[PDB]
Structure formats: structure tokens, C-alpha cells
């Protein structure tokens, strides 16, 4: 469009009149204080990242053997024939083994 | 008493998707807080790029 | 950014402004008394660690 063509140009005329302000010997230097302190930002977030991937390697370590626990009760249950009670501890289970599969998922995803 | 019986089959039903949604619960903060380090991760990213020191 | 480089430009006459009012012979020796108390800081922090691998 005209109105591009008229925008590239006064666009460009200014972002000319910026660059001839640059002293090289002032902005060379102030160049590398940013990119070391851009490099201090990062790092806490990438850490705050890793502090994640340990955390969810203990959740699922709580819930493979909570779920042990569940189905150990089960088979009480049914030696003491209470198969109304050894359904509810199954529902327990299930419960325990669909979240524990997000973990693995997440944590290699990590 | 055949009121009972059924009040007494809901009040167990009700307690079972308790017990499902608090660990439900867990799993669900523990992915609000990695997705959330995520973002604020790929936003300082963007910024730096946006800065482009080693350009100038 | 055409403000990302307004602000180099300006953020890096300041910072130049300060590094003439730096002294070499008042400063340099500053320096070094920073030095030596940031070690003393430290110490105190690590011996705070041993304490408890020792419990």
C-alpha cells in the first residue's frame, strides 16, 4: 500500500537518526552489562524449573506404593468374602494409578 | 427403613469422590506451578532477544 | 526496539558518568577492604553448613 511505502520511509529515516547517536566506546561496553545481567535472570528461572523435576519424582513415589497398599486390602477383603468392601478399595486404586501415569508423562516430558 | 438404606448408599457414594478429587488435587497444583515457571522462563527468553546486545 | 535502543544509549552515558568520578587511588584501595570483609561474611556461612553434616 502507498501508506506502507510512506510508513517504511519515515520509519527508517528515524531509526537512522537514532543510530548516529551510538558512541561506539559508551554502548560497547554497557552492551555487555546487559547481556551478564541477562544471564543472572535466566539462570533463577531454570533453576526454579529443575526444583519442579524433583518434586514430581516424589510424588510418584508416594502413589505406586499407596496404590500397593489399596490392593493388598483388597485381597483381604475378599479371604474375609466382604467383596462389597474389596470394590470400594479397588476404586481407591484406580484412582492412584491414572494420576501416577501423568507424573511419568510430565517428568519425562521435565 | 427403606429411606435409610438408600440415604445410607449416597452419604458412602460421597465420600468416595472426595477421596478421588483431593488426589486429583495434587497432581493438578503440581502442574499450575511447572507451567507457570515455564512461562515466565520463555518470557525472560523473549526479552533478551528483544534487547539483541550482541547485534548492537 | 527502537525504546530498548533510546535506553542503551541513555542507560550507557550514565554508567560512563560514574566511571569518571571513580579515584583511582581512594577507590582501589576500597576495593580490596570489600574484599576482605565479603570473606569474612563467608566463613561464617559455610561453617553454619558444617555444623549440621556433623549432626
Redesign the interface.
Known amino acids: 500500500g502507498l501508506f506502507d511505502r510512506l510508513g517504511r520511509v519515515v520509519r527508517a529515516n528515524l531509526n537512522d537518526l537514532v543510530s548516529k547517536a551510538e558512541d561506539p566506546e559508551k554502548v560497547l561496553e554497557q552492551a555487555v552489562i546487559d547481556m551478564q545481567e541477562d544471564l543472572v535472570q535466566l539462570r533463577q528461572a531454570v533453576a526454579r524449573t529443575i526444583a519442579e523435576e524433583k518434586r514430581t519424582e516424589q510424588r510418584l513415589n508416594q502413589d505406586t506404593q499407596e496404590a500397593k497398599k489399596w490392593e493388598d486390602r483388597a485381597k483381604l477383603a475378599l479371604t474375609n468374602g466382604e467383596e462389597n468392601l474389596a470394590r470400594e478399595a479397588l476404586a481407591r486404586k484406580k484412582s492412584l494409578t491414572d494420576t501416577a501415569a501423568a507424573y511419568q508423562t510430565q517428568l519425562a516430558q521435565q | 427403613r427403606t429411606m435409610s438404606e438408600n440415604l445410607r448408599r449416597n452419604l458412602?457414594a460421597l465420600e468416595?469422590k472426595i477421596?478421588?478429587a483431593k488426589?486429583?488435587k495434587?497432581?493438578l497444583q503440581?502442574?499450575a506451578?511447572?507451567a507457570k515457571?515455564?512461562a515466565?522462563?520463555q518470557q525472560?527468553?523473549a526479552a533478551?532477544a528483544?534487547?539483541?546486545?550482541?547485534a548492537?
Open positions: 458412602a468416595a477421596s478421588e488426589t486429583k495434587n497432581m503440581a502442574r506451578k511447572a515457571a515455564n515466565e522462563l525472560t527468553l533478551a528483544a534487547a539483541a546486545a550482541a548492537a
